[PDB]
What does this fold into?
Amino acid sequence: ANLRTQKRLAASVVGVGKRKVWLDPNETSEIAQANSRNAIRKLVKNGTIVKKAVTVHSKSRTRAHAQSKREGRHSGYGKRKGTREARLPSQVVWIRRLRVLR
Amino acid sequence: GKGTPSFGKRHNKSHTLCNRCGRRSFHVQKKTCSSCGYPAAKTRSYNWGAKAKRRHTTGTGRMRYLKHVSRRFKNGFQTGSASKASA
Amino acid sequence: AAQKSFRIKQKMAKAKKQNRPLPQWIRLRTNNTIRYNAKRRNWRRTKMNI
Amino acid sequence: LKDVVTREYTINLHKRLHGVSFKKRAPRAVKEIKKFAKLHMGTDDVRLAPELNQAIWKRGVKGVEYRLRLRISRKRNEEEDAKNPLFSYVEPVLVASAKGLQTVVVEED
RNA sequence: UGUACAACGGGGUAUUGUAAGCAGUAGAGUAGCCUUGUUGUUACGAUCUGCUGAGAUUAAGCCUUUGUUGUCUGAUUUGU
RNA sequence: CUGAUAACCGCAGCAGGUCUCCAAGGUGAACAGCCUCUAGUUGAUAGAAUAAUGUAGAUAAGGGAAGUCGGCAAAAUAGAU
RNA sequence: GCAGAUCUUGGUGGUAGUAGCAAAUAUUCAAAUGAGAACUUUGAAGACUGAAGUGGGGAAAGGUUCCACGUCAACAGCAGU
RNA sequence: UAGCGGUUCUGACGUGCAAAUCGAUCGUCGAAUUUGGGUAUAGGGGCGAAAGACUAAUCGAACCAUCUAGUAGCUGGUUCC
It folds into this structure.
């Protein structure tokens, strides 16, 4: 049929963006009968239109990479592209030292 | 540079709708119309521009008062009402 | 626009109500020769110059 | 006259997609499986199963596997029936090693 | 309807270069332990060795094949 | 309501032009460059072959500017200590 | 009175169904609508913009494009429901 | 970098995506910086870190209308036997 309006209202009702709404093709004509937000809120509850939950982005190799930098790795001369002032400046190393003495 | 991309920068108006001639010829900075000449006491009209007079002389609008002058001359400007004779 | 005068919005109202075809009954009229609506404006092809 | 016999296959897509541009190695793998089913089964309407469409596009446009274990079925047509009375229908079959398998006729029992 | 032809598979040839997985008083050290040693073990450990001249790919313009599965009379046109 | 490779201007649904606020993870000095999440798109005539000559990228043994008005175009160097 | 004024206005030609419709990495399968679906809609993929966005709003400018129903002769330089 | 500019390839395009764009390469990037909105300056007049440049695709001098059917020793045409 045509289900532009129903996908628009479904994303607007459930709260998630249009890239995450599910409109199953078995019930399609029934979804084409629902032309209001209140009817969408009844097609959401029974399970006809669901969330399509988030694509995972596991910051885990980030955690392994960080934990490996904690032990003293990834710090040779070739894993190092900014200068000795750009990474940790002279001024901050000094302000750390001289407040400590003070 | 002086052709189409400089045409891209053309988002304003010099002119807005004049109150006397309704034309979008009232200059915003100059505060004066350019087709009629509001807010002067006159309407600008020139014998060099014979078409512009023709576009705005008498007889092009409604004639909300002049239309009933010759007719009202035609009776000799009578006042009152007519009588009733028969039928 | 989106934050307008009232004079310009009044002219949008008049250019809205003029933006419709002939009524069908004018075509069938006695000695009618108005075949269509010739003063029709569209917002893409003819900007109204306010 | 029945000719409904379902057969499984390995199609060697490597010697079919050879030299094809990288933004056309998956869709031409599709247009090559339709020709393959025309060549074997003989009919001209072919329906790929969408699980096969997943099995072509696992590794993007240009990472088509070399050999796909197909199951080509041939069926009769209905519902204001088309220019052929029969069609083919190509499903994937899900195997560990698509290397080393011959062609095998599927029995329907 | 044929030592035909094709899709596969096998083999040769070729290219790269030793796969996945398992194991190992191999392993710089470092922790945790105990009879605290005269290889004292357990765990972490890029890598290394054995299986592995393996594994992958091999025709799209490589070679061969008795193995497996199939295909083999549609239209059109023509004469002194 | 759009606020722009279709809602403005450029004769048009024109790879141009026009003012700004928000703005995540990684590598990295970086609001660079590449990859991802929330969000948005998947629109830009398609199919088959893939020869001349092109446009855009590339690679060339030995020599090395001998080419040309001229090493112009390309290559090399390139970060950090 | 008319063959010609790079004559004026209107129409029609050959060229010629040719030049071409090639920037912005990209499409594919199934189902449904429908007379008819590379282009519509939904599901499954594959990707892209990569948060100085092809994301959320607004200033200017446009002016009813906003949203729904029905619809496809015209426009959408192919098609189209 | 963003921004602003526009140097070379005398590259692309050159009946173009564009009446001056595209792609690489490049100048500058914290101030004699860039930009919006308001306002001021108008044609032999403005404004000019000056190129006779810019003054709305026009500029050693704007555009519009009128005198104007300007003038022409110079081109072209000038209709039946």
Notes: Helices of chain B lie at 4-7, 50-56, 70-74. Chains B and D do not touch (no CB pair under 8 Å).
